[PDB]
Design a protein around this ligand. Structure first.
Ligand SMILES: Nc1nc2c(ncn2[C@@H]2O[C@H](COP(=O)(O)OP(=O)(O)O)[C@@H](O)[C@H]2O)c(=O)[nH]1
Ligand SMILES: Nc1nc2c(ncn2[C@@H]2O[C@H](COP(=O)(O)OP(=O)(O)O)[C@@H](O)[C@H]2O)c(=O)[nH]1
Ligand SMILES: NCCCCCCCC(=O)O
Ligand SMILES: NCCCCCCCC(=O)O
Ligand SMILES: [Mg+2]
Ligand SMILES: [Mg+2]
Ligand SMILES: [Mg+2]
Ligand SMILES: [Mg+2]
Lengths: 224, 224
């Protein structure tokens, strides 16, 4: 096949998509699985003044494989407003609705030259891109596998299970992984006992990202 | 009919269930709609030392209608652990799984003496109570209407829409209402433009709690 494609979404913004994407791509690359990081849509950015956006961090990592990459090669719709993409686009660029057909082509083009194409979304699954499409719709159009990153705090059970319900209702392969931050041991006392129970009772277990680099690489590359 | 029953859930813990429940019950009572507040299950509490739990706040309000009420009349499963109820119960009271049949009877008994029985859950909809039942399952067994309180911050679109998807997939009447806190005007700039669009395109609109006391009272009391 051409390269595999893995969409990275989350319970919400700030959960750890970028952090986990970079860790996974680094592991894959170290294993000989040539992996690019893409951030097709990004809000809340000012590229004239700030070079620490998700796309900029991705670009730094990506240039270890291709010096010629520039920001515009890996991120295509970028907005100042710290909001959902649909709103940002309507306010800042009212004449150019985000074109997910175009994005699909651009993202798939990287499957020629990479073993794995990692595509970070923005926010969570139900975040609107156009009037008709959210992040999950975009992932579905891409025919990507899904990795959904959860936060590690009180409330994660609800947030993971809401996403499980939405994902299991659609036609895609997915994993939910908790981004367990350093210094958090309340997680193991408070939330892990339920994850444990859930996993004994579910065909598709919720995993801890930091325990799961190998498993998630296997997941991303499996099958067609 | 006997009194109506309104379950109050949320996007997650700390969104504003208790705050909004109390405001709604106060408005209803002021309108002549005799309304009780119940918190059947509560975690993270130590009643020997602290009298500011949700049930305690409810009790204060409720005693304006019935001096004889005590905490045990309005809250039935109470745990120290700051966790989902299932986990708290398994750790603190392993021989007594939460009995939702019992709770259903106790809550419905109040429909004899009140026009409206408000039942606050714990956390969000997918929070586990028993191995087989979550908060939404409990609301379904109760045959209550649902009011789902959202937070007012960046990310609310995703959280509201995840809940919309789950709720619209089940057989109950529901409203989603944003708890818009004082001093937040970023909401109107950042999130409201999407709520506006969503409402033009949906049969069941997302409302702002503080704008909606009358509407939500009408909702709670409508029909059988
Ligand atoms: N202290 C700490 N911060 C983290 C960790 N993982 C992510 N973060 C921080 O959390 C914030 C959000 O992470 P990010 O990966 O950008 O999340 P995204 O918005 O979902 O892509 C950033 O400031 C990260 O540096 C961690 O393990 N420890
Ligand atoms: N400053 C401020 N705090 C609020 C408001 N609404 C709720 N809170 C606080 O948010 C916290 C969580 O609210 P609560 O109603 O208990 O949420 P629940 O856990 O969903 O029942 C409490 O400390 C409240 O006092 C508000 O409008 N302004
Ligand atoms: N204030 C006590 C709140 C208990 C919240 C339980 C949240 C469980 C989860 O969804 O992870
Ligand atoms: N860091 C830019 C993050 C943009 C997050 C958009 C969240 C929209 C919502 O679900 O309310
Ligand atoms: Mg971010
Ligand atoms: Mg990110
Ligand atoms: Mg609370
Ligand atoms: Mg509460």
């Amino acid at each position: 096949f051409q390269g595999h494609m893995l969409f990275i979404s989350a319970t919400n913004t700030n959960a750890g998509k970028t952090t986990c994407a970079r860790l996974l791509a680094q592991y894959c690359n170290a294993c000989g699985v040539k992996t690019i990081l893409l951030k097709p849509i990004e809000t809340g950015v000012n590229d004239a003044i700030n070079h620490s956006s998700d796309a900029h961090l991705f670009l730094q990592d990506n240039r270890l494989l291709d010096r010629s990459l520039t920001l515009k090669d890996i991120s295509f719709y970028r907005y100042h407003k710290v909001s959902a993409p649909l709103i940002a686009q309507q306010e800042e660029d009212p004449n150019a609705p985000i074109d997910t057909d175009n994005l699909t082509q651009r993202l798939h083009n990287f499957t020629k030259t990479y073993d794995l194409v990692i595509v970070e979304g923005a926010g969570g699954l139900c975040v609107p891109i156009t009037l008709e499409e959210n992040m999950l719709d975009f992932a579905l159009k891409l025919k990507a596998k899904m990795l959904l990153i959860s936060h590690d705090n009180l409330g994660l059970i609800n947030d993971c299970l809401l996403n499980d319900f939405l994902l299991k209702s659609h036609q895609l392969d997915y994993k939910i992984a908790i981004n367990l931050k350093g210094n958090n041991t309340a997680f193991h006392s408070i939330s892990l006992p339920y994850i444990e129970l859930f996993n004994t009772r579910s065909n598709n277990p919720i995993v801890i990202f930091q325990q799961s680099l190998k498993v998630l690489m296997s997941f991303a590359l499996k099958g067609s």
